[PDB]
Structure formats: structure tokens, C-alpha cells
């Protein structure tokens, strides 16, 4: 088109990238700057029809889920598929204890306040520019 008014912004995925930034800052992340940048480019790619925009978001949801899983320190799918039967056969007390040790209430509080702050800022300030600037800064630092 003449002006390509298909650069609407990251919209919701601002929270996705802010959560990734926070988890990298806390030190729990094996961050992948190149894949994060390519994901941002896929989210921001201009598309003419709104149908293709919606389809792009729908296809990006599972890829974003997989990328976030890959960027954490949790074990891979092979261990999960090999130990699912053992977990099912384990007693309820051990599962409950593991669940309790898995959840950190401080992390939940930080994530919730981040979501509230993101709601306010998106109501005021465009976040996509900042998110992409931070991604570019991380990639430049890493490659240099």
C-alpha cells in the first residue's frame, strides 16, 4: 500500500517480552537474543488483511510458548515424556511437595505487578519501541 498502516505494534506481546526481560534479569534465563529478535520481527511484520494478522497471532502463540520454554532452565521434553509415567505412579504427597517447592510467591507478585504496570504504561506510552530497542541492544551487546 501507500503507507503500510500494518505496523500496529506488538500489542499484547509487550507483556511476553517484559516477562522474558525480567526473568533474564533475575538470572533464571538462558536468553537467546537472535531468536527473540526474530520473534519480535515476526510479530511486527506488516500484513494487509486482518484475517492474516489474526492467523499470524494464532500461529505465534505456540511458537512463543515453545520459545519461552526453551529460554528457561527447565528440562527438555524428552525427560518429561520419559518420566510422565513415573510421575503418574508417584504418591500425591510427593507431587504436592514438588508443586509447593516449584511455586515462588515472590515471582508471582513480581509478575502481577509487572502486568499492572504494563497495563498502565500501554494506556499511556507505546511499549513496542522500547521492547524492540532493548532487544536490539541485547543482540548488539552479545554479538560484539
Amino acid at each position: 500500500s501507500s503507507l503500510w498502516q500494518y505496523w500496529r505494534g506488538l500489542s499484547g506481546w509487550n507483556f511476553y517480552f517484559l516477562v522474558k526481560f525480567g526473568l533474564l534479569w533475575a538470572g533464571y534465563l538462558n536468553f537467546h537474543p537472535l531468536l527473540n529478535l526474530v520473534f519480535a520481527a515476526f510479530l511486527l511484520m506488516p500484513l494487509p488483511r486482518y484475517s492474516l494478522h489474526r492467523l499470524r497471532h494464532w500461529i505465534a502463540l505456540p511458537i512463543g510458548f515453545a520459545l519461552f520454554w526453551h529460554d528457561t532452565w527447565l528440562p527438555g521434553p524428552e525427560s518429561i515424556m520419559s518420566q510422565g509415567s513415573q510421575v503418574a505412579g508417584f504418591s500425591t504427597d510427593y507431587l504436592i511437595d514438588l508443586v509447593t517447592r516449584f511455586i515462588n510467591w515472590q515471582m508471582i507478585g513480581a509478575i502481577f505487578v509487572l502486568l499492572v504496570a504494563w497495563l498502565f504504561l500501554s494506556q499511556w506510552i507505546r511499549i513496542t519501541v522500547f521492547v524492540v530497542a532493548i532487544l536490539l541492544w541485547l543482540n548488539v551487546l552479545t554479538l560484539a
Binding site: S2, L3, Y50, G109, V113, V116, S122, W124, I125, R126, V129
Partner: protein, 822 residues
Amino acid sequence: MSILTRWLLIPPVNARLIGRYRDYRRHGASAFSATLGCFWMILAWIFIPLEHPRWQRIRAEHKNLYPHINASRPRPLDPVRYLIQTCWLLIGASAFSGLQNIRGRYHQWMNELPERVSHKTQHLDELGHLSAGARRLILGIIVTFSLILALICVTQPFNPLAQFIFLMLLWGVALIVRRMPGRFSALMLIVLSLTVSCRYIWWRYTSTLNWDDPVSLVCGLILLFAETYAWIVLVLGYFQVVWPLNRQPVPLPKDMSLWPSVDIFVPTYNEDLNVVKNTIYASLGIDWPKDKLNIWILDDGGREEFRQFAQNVGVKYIARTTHEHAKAGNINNALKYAKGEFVSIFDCDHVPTRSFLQMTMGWFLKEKQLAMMQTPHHFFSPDPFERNLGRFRKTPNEGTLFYGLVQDGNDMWDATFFCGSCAVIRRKPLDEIGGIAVETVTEDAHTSLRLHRRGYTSAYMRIPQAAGLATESLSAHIGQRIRWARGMVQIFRLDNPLTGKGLKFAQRLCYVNAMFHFLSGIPRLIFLTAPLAFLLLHAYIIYAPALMIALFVLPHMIHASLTNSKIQGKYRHSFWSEIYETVLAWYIAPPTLVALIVDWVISRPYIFLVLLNLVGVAVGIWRYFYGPPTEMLTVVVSMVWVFYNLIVLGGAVAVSVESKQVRRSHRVEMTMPAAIAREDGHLFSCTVQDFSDGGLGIKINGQAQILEGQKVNLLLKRGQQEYVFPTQVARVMGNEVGLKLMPLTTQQHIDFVQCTFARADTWALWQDSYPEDKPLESLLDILKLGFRGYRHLAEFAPSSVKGIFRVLTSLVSWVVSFIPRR
């Protein structure tokens, strides 16, 4: 100049450039300015693709996106402005319909959740229905538990992060419960703000009082006592307006035989007849039987004009030879001859409405010990804070908050004090109390207190049923406020409400809280000059890191502002109460202090304070680089404090611009239906914009055919009656038609005032047109108010400071030229 360009540029492009330069010069640009502008234009076309359709659209909308950049007049440092604005535009945020619909549905659900909860709790009411002793014990233990939790919430030591998180969570609580209609949410927010303010005051009293210098200790105590006074006043005000009663008018008996006789006193000392006329014409229209009403005119001037007026309009006139005790004496003298069961004092300017004496007289027959029922005061003319600031029907009057919420709240505790006029007092209690109070200057509050001490209750009605002329000068408004202050002070010095018998403690609290506003000058002055204790002298008044102050003081201000904006919603715009206080807080203070132990008069203190604060900001700019990098944020906080003080003082100066006023009759801008008829049998409608005492205003739809010498009969329709009065075309300037009303006899004036002024429906739609109280809308508005005040002072100050204010205002405007705009 053209020869050099032709030597440099080919005739086509040279002609283009010469045309562009001439276009620049035609708009008043200088040679240097236009030259640099052409250089910037050629560079910009080199770099930015202005031929791209995006940039065609951006240039087409150059006015909106860059309001502070004039395309036709280039100026030095334009690229700096362009860069700042473009950086903000990239920073700023510009299928939204679905998101808006979802957000609106969410808002509606949140608003209606209390409604559904109330319906569920009402149909299943079944809250006090247990046994008496168990109920009392349960209430006591539950209150003690709640107070213990509040105490642990108040005094808990917290580190930066913890304190910040607590602040955020409680503010979210306040934001969520703010958008909750009802009267319970007001109680929730009052309790929450009380807990937060107790936390802040405890922090100040237990961790941040400096004991290291005999110089930073006395000042710290002064500031902490100012804040303690502010908190005490806020708490008492919360108690005052906790739950407005929303009293409802009582329908009178259907028969007209048991109704009483009402005596209406209109006192006058120096007012002209041109204001009393409308009041007495609308009084004759009062929807009361004519055999049980007595409208009185009392003249301290001994004038014969009021005698003739009263005789020819059918009302009573009485004048006295000896004038003692002013309004109190005149009203008592009138009461001496008033053979009626009721006395209703109306001001010399507050026009009564037809549905007044029946919308407020039912309670006098239901409650058999009632003695006073006050009615609200609504000013149609611009008050000195509206005319001078261009704030007519955009910012409410000072008394709007009071007369809309505070006295309705006082009705709960039975402390609604007589407000000067516009109220009904039963004469049987009035004879017992001796009449109108004559000792002090505020007769009204003293009389109400004397009524209350005898056990007789008092009432209040909310519907605006009295419109009057607002104050016509800032000096006279200051005089009115100072008279109120002096009268309350005299009342306290002569009769303390707190120490007495027969009064509930709530009445004493309301009485004293009504008299904590007239001692609120000293705290205002202390706050204004408080930052001039670290920037000018070197004293740490608040011995704490600058983050902690911004984390304890800030919740107090935010929660107080949010709660007050919720409770006093469409009554008082934020940060304007501070402006009113500082406007008053130089002249009401000296009388109270004596009791305890442009303009060369009105605006000298503002000049003093602005000079001192400017010295402070200069010294603070000094300390920002010479100061150690540790003691840096303290200077930043104190500079923000001084900037707030400067906005305050600029607004105070702005209020004092007595503008031109030649309209003999104040215009009430409301929409009412009217019609015009010529000598042809065809009737033309018209759109009426405003009227006045001796005029009108109509905008004809189409402006068919009229001249300045033709005769047009004006038809005014009320209810189902059509009224004809002679009118003359006064102004013809297109779609605006001017009309002047000639002097008339009695009945014509009665009909006209009933058709235009005394309509008991206009003020409701007026209140419906009040803009919502919005902090951000206030921000730029108050900043512009302060800037206008500074500019006006720079215009009308002494020369030796005229230069100083001139250069300062020039710098301020120059900087604001760079600040981005949306």
C-alpha cells in the same frame, strides 16, 4: 542575494528556492532566520523522504502534530524542536472498537456489582438481628480486631522495596473502590485514607525528626506541626461529610387550611433597587396562597424608591430611623412587626423560586421540633475566580462544594448552620432564642448554634432554589471570606461549641471543623516557605533519604486527593482549594493571630513569596552541581516543592486580574424555547442562548428577514400559557440578534421574571453540565493559570522587578516552546 544563488543554482531550482525564501520572508521572518530555515529545509529533504506518502500525510497534518512549530515562519533552533517532538511522537501512543466495548462492559459490570450485591442482601435481608448482648459483644470484639490489624498496618517498619509495593497495592485498592457508586465506598476510602495518613504521620513522628542540630530541630517541629494540623483538619472534615443525609422534601397536606403563614424579609442597606426588583418579582410568584404570605422589604437607606416599588407591586415596606446591629438589628425590627408563624430571610440578590415554600415546608409539619431549614446558594454571575480567569461554567464556585455536600453531611449530625439567608426559621423557637444574633458579625452561625443548644433540630435541602449575583471583585470576595472568618473567631472567643451542655459531640466537631478553615493560613504560609530551609539555610527538616520521603508523603497526598475527588466529585476541582486558601491565607490569618494572643495591597504577599521562591530556585540550581552526589535527590525534591509553590503563587496572582465589565445586566446562559411573530401571520422559531435583567439573546435559524428598525413581537411560552411583551431589536450582527427590555409595570415584571429567572428547572441542567473533576485536566489548566498570573504581574509590577519578571517569563515561554505537545 539572488545573484549568488543564480551563480550557485540553475534557474529552475534557483527560482524554486527564491520563491520559498520569499514565502518565508512574507510572514515576518528575518533574513538570518529565513536563511537558516532554508538550509534546514534542504538538509531535511536530503535525509527524510518527504515525497513518500507517509510524509505527504505528515506534512498535510503539520499543524496538529507540531502545534508549537509554525511552518510558514521558520525560527532559530527549529531542528531542536522538531527532534524533541518527533522523539515524543515515536514514544507516544496514538480494531479499537472491540477493546473499547470490552472495557466499557467491564466498567459497567464493576459499577453494577454493588447494585447486584445490594439486591441480593436486600431480598435476603434476614446486620443487627441477633440478641442484644451478643450483638454488642460481637461488635466490640470485631472492632478491636479490625483496629489491631490497622495498628499493625500503620506502624510496620519497611525498607524501600517493601514500602513501594505496599503503596502500589493500597493505591490499586483506592483506584478500584473509587469507581464504586454508593455511600459505602466513601466509608471504605475514608477508613483507608485514615490508616495511610496515620502511617505517614507515625513515620514522621518516630523516624524522621532530626536531632543533631539546634537549627534543624525547631524548623522540623514547625513543619511537623503544620502537617499534624492538616491531618487533624482532614480527619474532622472526613467526619463532617462522612455520609450526607440526602434529605427528601415532604409533600404538604393536600388541603390548604392547615398550612402556615410565611413572612419573607428582604434586608437592604446600600443595594440599588435594580437587584431587589427581580427578587421581589419572583417572590410574588411564590406558589403559596396569597392570604398566608407576607413579602417584606426593609431599607436602611431610608429610600423612597423602595416604598413606591413595594406599594405598586403589592408587598410590604418597613424602614427604621435608627440603624443598630446592621442586618441583625434590621431583621429583628422586622420580626417585631411580622405577624406570621414563620420567618424566611432572603438575601437582597438571591431570587426565590416558585416551588420554594412548598419544597421545604413539609418537614416543619412532620418534625415538630425543627427550627431552621437552609437552602443552597447558586451563583449565576461569574465569581471573582471565574471572570478573571476565563473560568465561567467551567470551574465551580468556591461555595459549590460546601452547599452541595458539606451541609448535607452536617444534616446527619444536626449542625447545618444558617448560611446568611435563603432559609426558613419557625418563629416559635426564634422568639425563645431572642431573634437574630447581634453580638458578632456572623449572626447566622451564632443564631444556629443558639437554636441547637436548646435541643431544636435543624434541616437542609439540596435542590438549588436560589440564584444570586456572585461577588463582583476579588477584594469584595476576600472581604466576605474574612467576615466569615472573623465571625467564627468571635463566636469561639465568646461561645465555645466544644464546651457546653445539651449538644452531641458530633455537633461540636462540626462547629470546630467549620472553624479550622479560618485558621488555615499559618499552615499554608509554613508549607510555602518550608523549602526555604534547606536551599537557603542548610537544615534537614526531614532527616530521611529522599526516596523514603517520596514513599511516605506521597501516599498521603494521593489517597487524600483520590478520596476527596470521589466524595466531592462534581463540586471542587482539584488543586483549586489550595489556590483559594493561599489567596485567603494572608488576610484572614492576622485577625485570628491577634485573637489567639498590580495592587499595592491585594497582591504584595504574592510578590514577596515569588521573589523568595525564585531566590530559592536559583540557589538550588547552584547546589545541584556544587553539592555532593549523595545529597543530590534532596535538592531535586525541594526544587519540585518550590516549583509547586511557584505554580500556586502564579495562580494566586492570576486570580487578581480585574477584567473589563460593562454589562449592566449579568447574562444567565441557558437554553429556553421562544418564538417571534411579525405582522404577516407566520411564526418563526428561535434558539435562545442567554438572557439577563434587561435583555435577551436569540439566534434565528436562517435569519429570514429583519432589520434594526422593524418591530417584532416576542412570544414566551411557559407550561401551556403564551405571554406577549414588547421587545426591541438592539443588535443585528448576523446569526446573533440583540434585544433590550424596556422598563415595565408590576405585573409585566412578575410574568417576565417567572418566565426567565425563577424557573426551578434550569439549575439542575446547569449542574448536569459541570465538567467532571479530573486531575490531569486540572494540571495544564493550572499551569496556564500560573503562567498567565506571572505574565500579568510582569506587566504590572514595579520596573526594578518588571525587568526580572520579564526575563523570567521570557525564559519560561522559550522553554515551553521546546516542550512536546500531543
